[model samples]
Target: KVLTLEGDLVLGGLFPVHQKGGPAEDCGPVNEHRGIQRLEAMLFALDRINRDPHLLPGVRLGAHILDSCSKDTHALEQALDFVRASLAPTAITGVIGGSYSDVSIQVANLLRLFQIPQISYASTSAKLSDKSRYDYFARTVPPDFFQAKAMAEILRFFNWTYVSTVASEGDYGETGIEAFELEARARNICVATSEKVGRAMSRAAFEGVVRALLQKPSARVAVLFTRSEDARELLAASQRLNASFTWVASDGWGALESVVAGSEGAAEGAITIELASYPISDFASYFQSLDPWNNSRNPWFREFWEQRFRCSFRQRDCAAHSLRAVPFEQESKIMFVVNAVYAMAHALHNMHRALCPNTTRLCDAMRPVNGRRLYKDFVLNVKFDAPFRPADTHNEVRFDRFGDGIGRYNIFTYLRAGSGRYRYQKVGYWAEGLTLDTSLIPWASPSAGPLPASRCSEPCLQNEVKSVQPGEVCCWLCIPCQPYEYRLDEFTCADCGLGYWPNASLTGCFELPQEYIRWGDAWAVGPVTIACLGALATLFVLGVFVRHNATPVVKASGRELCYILLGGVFLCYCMTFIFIAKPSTAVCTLRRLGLGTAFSVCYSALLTKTNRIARSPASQVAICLALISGQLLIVVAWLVVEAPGTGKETAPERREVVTLRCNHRDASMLGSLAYNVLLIALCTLYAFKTRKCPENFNEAKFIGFTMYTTCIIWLAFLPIFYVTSSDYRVQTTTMCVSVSLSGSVVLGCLFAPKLHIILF
Candidate 1:
């Protein structure tokens, strides 16, 4: 039998009133959640539309609602009845319902043949979105593709990388999981195992499916993209095995009590996806008003009343739940069917407006409703306040080009009564983007920890990459990036640019410390002070020698040689000041000139005193001037050839600092010093030769000590001076100390003895 009502124009509906439980009688027990609740929702929408004078003033919508017995073949037969009625030239214009994907598919093919547009309330197969095949098909609930994406996003939100999946064998399961697998893999989430089974196909096979899911003991998170019936069967299998599963389920297993009714423990803490829903403000009142006596048009109402009130009207003596509160187990997708009805009404209303806008009643054109124009011009473009939340006055409801409705879903979890209460509470929602009340959501299997870390590998905590297996994208092993490396991507590290180093995070490179001796440095002040002290000492010695020019001791020591060498000593101490400054053009030039000339003049004068070819005062003066002339020429030529400059000195091993120093590297800096060193060697050898000439009356022994000490100082300078890759401040300090010490040695060794003789 079917539920029918008369009106000016009739609409056809196909709902699964009785579940497909078997045999000669395919229609079985009442399914209140999907069947009864959704059936009442459509009627509620129709009555509201007809009651509202603004919705359709002239037309009264009628319904020829049928039961499909939750079977595809049965739904197809019901769809054929509509076809036969429409071909008889009846005004049965449109079709709605068929909650299963395969049923929707069969009806869509038949409905499109006659151009009778059909809208599905809950058939979310990805294949239905293909406009080429199901051209006249559209849906109020979004397709499985969007649901799949939502499921994948929820997986990623929980950091669940390794999971297993089970699918019921049909378009709903196969196509839904196919889309889910694509989306899950795109997010780098992996399915540890996947198994498909017919709707409760085998008692033994379902056990095997659960066995495969728990093959890895840690693969506790399982995705169930199955029908409510199959989902219940799987839960039963899991319960029989005494297995606790953290289930991730599609809307097929939404907030229905049947799925987890008997196996509450098995499905505890199940994270299920539900269509974004709300309380139908007046739907509660309408449902509470329903009973066997008041609503006799629907044949299933008697069964629903008897089952809900726990009383049968056939046996009047039974009175158990009659006076109790009406058990309104609200279906989550009731709004979807309601939206489906409103969509058809609005489309027909608009057609009336376009064809018979000026008329007060049904015109000749309105008598025969054109299904093609109704869908293409009106339905496909229909927008309304689908107040799924009828509690308030409200894209409005709009559809995509592919005819899928607004894609939005709520993340719900089952909280079983135990340590607390039993309910399915919404923890998050998805509307193109996913948002969660993460703290409110409970994890599976309560413990000390909030979550059980559903991943194959731990996170990389240090500045490291969790390297994946050759082709594996989900799980990985940690590999630290090198000190000089930068993070090129999430899983790989690469070398940084020159003079740059990886910062702590390793996302990018950072510039190093600039290694220059700032004037405030402790090393810097030492050189400056010694330069000042030695210069003052040189001036003091010069004053003593000048005052004693006519004295016996001044004449004993070569007179002009005394004046010339002391002047050179002053210049050598002044060279130390140059090393203290930050590198620049003028400082470098002076460093070159002062370093060579100062040493040349001092060593030249010392050479004449310890000469095997002994010289007079004037000869000593001429030789010292000539040696100083050689150093000046060399310094000017070196300047003209390369023009001294400050260079960005770098050491490869440490990119953390850039050293600024002289333009020339070790090669040229050492080459320029060779002339000064030649003067010292000649003076040293000459002092050795004249060692015998000094018994007690000669100054040659003092000159010999000065030359030997100078040689030892140069030996120390060589190692620290030209080591190019060492810190620039260390190299600069080496030169500063050597210059100041060499100048002091000349003054102490030769002039100290003469100054003492003259003063005493």
Candidate 2:
């Protein structure tokens, strides 16, 4: 191997091009490995920059590429080789590799001693951004922080609250999962199980972790932070367990076609977060045209070509095998490698102008660029507007203080095509500041139109509340709200307000039905019928007295007082109608006035008749008219001061209906009741005083019994009325029944005896 360094700028390249066995374990050769495509991107970008006059004019770049075998030992050895070259008179200006974070971190620490700048294409461990420790390290990819947040956002978009996690036992998996757990917890997503499996584990070794993951029945989603090989083994183990789950994949093996090749059904409907896609038309064409026989400078090309065509190197049949149908799009991370090379070239170009600031001829092709001086002058300060392709607008590319690229990611999910191949579908996107674009997310079912839910428990319904499950923030049970209370959301249960009640479903509250005592109700009809019959009997008795006016029975019974009592009893019976119907302003006013004045007249007539028997008839009618006029005045005063009106009363304990009541002030009603009671008391006193009268004067006995019955009914009604305001129908019914019974008592004890004497 002749070492020829003939370019103005020399760079070192490190790529994982083998399977870690020796030169024979090189996965056929460099051309067959997926990582080789990334290396070709760097070389292709160098060729493009050399041809363009605006970039690196009159200068050519050369690269010394080596296979790291995706191992720390090989990566460190290659990095030490570059460090030795740095001691030469004209050393390699920078390094471009170590794809994995474990290899990158090790290589970066070693390169820091030589102050050689290393730009990685895919190393995304967050610890690599510690500038104080690895000052020479920078990357074209964003750190694991952004990827973690993107993963968390993807989980939230699917509403997958309870999930399990499996990661490779390395710094990449451990640190990446740590960042993901932090973001997942912030979004209230519970990680049910977090197990670490060996990176290159077999199916037998992966079964233990898979078994632990399946033990948690609530975990319907599993997030894997592992390499392509480890992910393959984990999926196989899960297939053996016959468990189905939605898989969340990190960028490590997200776009690897090999991982999904054999496990078609197991990897279906998997979601992944990947770097944004950019076109590389020129590189793709160049890659398609490569021929090992023509490009003899590549030492391992013959072995790769023989294996790719399944023929010996000199076989004539090998010429018939065409490489034109190879799909270059299946290769991942190639564009990132191109960007990495462009970034290095731009930074070096700026450094050359800043250090050698004369004509193009004044720049020295022999003098080696000092790594530390170049880092301070241009590497840390490089800011450029890099276009995604020739036709697209430029996106600004700049590194922050931590040497992390400001990058965005496209969220994708795998959907089965008609040909049975799984194709990637763009579902969403993620950018800086945790911004997300979820307009294209597949919320429909995987088989048809809507996305299925990946949750431990279903959401609480509108009529239910949440009962959190133990030891998990995202798991919960649903409990129904009480009948008197309604739940508008999952967290709160609100009581119904006054005049309202919760529906039977308990979903919401509604206004209570407008209820009042109607004339057609059975309760009202029974009482009203009795009152009407009593009123007719009283009218018949009054007619009998009028016919018998010439007889001694009618004349001796105090005809004037008897007529007054009969008229009063008829009015009291009519007042029962006011209590039966729905209360209005007119009905309320009539109920108070009619009941008060009519009862007063009945009691006053009794008092007057008793007085006439006990003493003289000169002042008996005058005292009766005076007592009746006083009660009428009291009713008039009550109506004038505070007129009755319609109102409502709510009974929370009953929780059935609201009472529509009359709003007559208690003070005025009580005053009228007190005056009526006073009339009854005076009538009773007069009757007691005349208790010793002759047997012919038997009206005192009847008056005494009638007043005692009236007093007893009023005494019982006052307490019942005061407490029954919350139930207006009951209150009105009680008052109506009392009025009817009292009027019947007046007719029976006082008027019925006079009628019996006059007729029989």
Candidate 3:
């Protein structure tokens, strides 16, 4: 037994004072064990509590520390000693330790039989929260639930979608990994392999897990849930295999110096979650002040001092050595131990006041304190402003219904420092409710310039949409958008709206280029020039005919009919201007009515002259007016039913521009041309009938030739016009050339010969 007692109130403690081995073999003395530092911290806190007048007043706190040797049997053997002590003259008030969760559960069960309150500094198994199982068990450390959440959050922050999970074969590892898997799945992360290994696994079994992990090439991130010694073996296996991986470690052995120190370079760039650290005032100095020879009551101090200095206890030089140079990191759990002792001390102080009513001196030292009553009334209701710094900006030290402390965790990543040693860098933090702050995370990898990807599939690029792989959301294939559709993001394709088109890259939608015949363009220039010449020629012919109005040749061709025919030819030539210009409301209207009415008048005049050559009684002038009137009526009615207007039509190929042209609906446009065809048919029939007339009646031969040329021009124009309608330039040019050539044929054949007869 290694115990220290100097006060009336005694507290029991269970610490791993020796390495686990056979019963006969003593693995050196208890003081040489690293876990003894936790007991030292409790002792330091107890002394401070007794010295503080505001805490216990006259009551001095004492502890009965025992060596558990990190085993459940040893822990149970010592717990029974405390149970017997509770039945003695001065009963123990509470127990402050049982570092390992399994050891704590064993001691806590036995302690619960006597209603003795137990506060563990490090036990974090989720099963310990059940009040029915361990009624008096409470702890300064939070349960594994919080640790699992922090682990999952770290993986999510780095966007590691695929990872391998390795957990020790125990309750702590099992429950922790179960919680972590749930959270990982919720965040759309996939676990490629889940492996379980014992605390002491054979090399063959360890290699099997590593092989399984390496099988998944996409799983570059690994999550480790194991004890410190277990992690050492696993990392050794990783080194043997020469595997490189970014490891995400759980809280269990994440901050353990021994685990990281033994890994060489295998554990570099490992991300870990640890309980948030706070400054423990004067703890480092007091730890250094310990002198083994001077403190005779602590039988194990000599062994600890000898082991620390690498000198035997028998050596005289060992006595002269100072412990001031020893690093405080060797006793990293000291803060948690100190907090646990303070919690018990504060609860005792409150219980003392409640039991005594007024003054602290009034409490009877002879009477035995009721453990059940103290646990129910004081421990359960214990509340205090802890001396340690809070984990968060608004954090306060408190326990919930499950006896778990409310605190946040500091996230850290291991990086090579200037000293070539892997040191933990403060990267981020995590709190309850899954709150996280990762602003300080180093996203750059040591070898790879940026963080490596751990995804089953590559990200979808712009102009492509994601098509999720079968049975897996994280894995996907990219499908490119069609020409009519575009994509600016990864998920879905968007349709380009009317008058808008997708650019070549499919990254954006742009306005379609407007297609029309501009007179300045090369294609339009030739047709426009020809139209101007034709118009001038028509005017000249009219001048010549008027100058020779009384000549035999001019009189022979009816003067009124010839004048009407010249006027119609001039209008037809002018109509070509409408086709060569950009389409608009007024241009479309004139294109429909002007072309139809002008051609109709010319055909009607020719029809009247032919009817006279055929020896009809109907007056030629009246016949021309009636035919012209009928065409005008048809044009007006066609406009009323469906007015012509400019509209767009998409090109049938890769070009993005749309054709802007006059709206010539099939029914209305064909109706507008029906009367012109009728007049041409009448003229052609009359020309054939008068073909046998005298040689002086040469107008009949000219009329037949003019009608034949006009019919052929129009018949060829309709099909070419309809087929090339989407090409605005082609359609416009065809219409212009057809009308200009038809008018030229009528003027040159019918009037040009008559003019030659008059002038020559």
Candidate 4:
């Protein structure tokens, strides 16, 4: 049987030889036999396979072990010489072991020159599978391209359209990032940034690159294309930048599990794509049985290698070296080697029967059974359809994720675990699909949509009306709608307060005068028993006084006119009271306008008579005509606008708590404005005509009092009318009741003495 040697023995031999050259006597530990130990294990397996009588009857199998340590090319040549001498006539079967791609390539080239087949179980360099090298070398582990593609797919799923790569400046780093970039581009993902941090890079250089990545807005995902230990340092640099970005690493980083552990949880959520799930229990269990290095005890295969074919401590720099000692440690690579040997043996056996013994027969036998069928069993069925050709089993690469960026790993998630442990997770596969909402500037909700235009502006202040433009949906300005005013069509401000209720559409508002307040009360309450008692008392006192003092006939005409004026005052007072006591919103506007007009007429009459007594008869005649015309116009307006069934009394049945109010339908817009303007003008005129008169003169005092009272009452009424009339009409009843009560009292006190003296 052909014996295969792993590269570890050659590497171990080279270390001792190199140390001796440097005058080192101890040379540390001798691990030179690890390469031959791998061969011994393979030969034992082959012997078992050959002696299984069920498969190969009457055939006894024997093995010749060879040691081709990984780093010793001379040793490998010697091992080949040993294989040639020992297995010469049988047409040598393929060699099985090469711990690394570089050593495996050398052994493969040697085997090709010798026209013997060689298959590597673990050589994963992309160039080895190109078929350009005489179709000799084959590997079970897939090239790095497959793992890169898987990682790219995961990133694409996250919608990480833009990415940055921080890879080591090595062949592995260059090749890995190149493959990832190509795959990412094929998927329409963009690589916005690429930074190379070499193996020996200083912290400062690494930090600078990380800072640059942080500055790039589009670089949201960072692919760490380096060893795990270096990736930890890179992650530290990135974390120091305080950037909000995610990271992805490749399988090279898997070797330094301590690096991830040392990251103190920073490596959480990081994703890695791998080829194999780690800690092959089945392979480890089998290796434990035949391992001869541990004195028949089941030590770990790597430990057994060190104890049996011990290596010097100085030669073992990384854990990757110890991994080279155990061929069975890598299951796929072992399968490829075993399968290749079997195929080669089968072809030789067939040739021995079919052809005459010759060199040509050996070549012809090799031509019949190819490396394609041999590698198929180990390569996820990937076939190499050529004579003595190593199988193109590159497609059997499995994709698995070892960990989430946070923590935890699963081997089945990746094609090969441990070696290719660049971290990755499925959770982050769609993380980029989510977007942060920036609509609510003052407050934020993860689920909220964009802000509406209405809330974009400042809130409207209280006690103000929003002056919005016509047809506009949002308010533009806050305009104060004071209690005594109403806004007209968004832009105009008009005074329409309590005592001045607005017309139906709020176009105009009118005021209730003091005279109307007193007169309406008198009219409503005049026929009651209280009125009869007051009237009777006045008549009795007047009769007694008039009897006690008889006056001259010449004074009677002026007194007679005073008596007539008294009657008019009482009549107007009664009418005002009746309207004030009436309760209804329908006649609220009319009541306000009517009362204002009554004050004007009464004051005009008083002024006209005062002028006749103090000035001339012609002034009396002009004043009288104005008063009569004004009264007639007021009466006609009130009658036309009076609302039907608009009045209610303050009886117990009506309501327990009722407001003393006046009911008058509002006059038309033009009508109410014209009436108020006319009254205001007349009051102004009378004041101008009479302001210079003597203060103590009875006629002047009487006219001045009438004008002053009217002005005072209506001035107060003006704001109330405007405020209550428009928006706040319902709120003005208190003011209406107070003014009405005050006027009623004043009129009663003023006229009581005069009426008693005149009637008697």
Measured by lDDT, the strongest candidate is: 1
lDDT of 4 at 678: 57
lDDT of each: 0.76, 0.72, 0.73, 0.46
Backbone clashes in candidate 4 total 77
* TM-score against truth, every candidate: 0.65, 0.63, 0.70, 0.41
Model 1's alpha-carbon lDDT is: 0.76
> Which residue runs does candidate 2 get wrong by more than 4 Å?
1-52, 58-88, 111-115, 142-163, 185-193, 199-220, 255-257, 272-338, 362-373, 380-401, 405-451, 461-464, 467-471, 486-498, 501-760
Candidate 3's residue-wise lDDT over 650-736, tens digit each? 644344343356565647667558656866776687678765568545666777777877777777777876677466666677778
Arrange candidates, best lDDT first. Answer: 1, 3, 2, 4
Candidate 4, residue 692: the lDDT equals 54
Query: Could you tell me which 10 consecutive residues in candidate 3 have the lowest summed lDDT?
Result: 651-660
1 versus 3: better lDDT goes to: 1
Task: Give the range where candidate 4 is weakest over 10 consecutive residues by summed lDDT.
Answer: 8-17
Error of 2 at 655 (Å): 6.5
Q: Could you tell me which 10 consecutive residues in candidate 1 have the lowest summed lDDT? A: 317-326
Q: RMSD, each candidate, Å? A: 7.7, 9.0, 7.1, 17.5
Ranking by TM-score: 3, 1, 2, 4
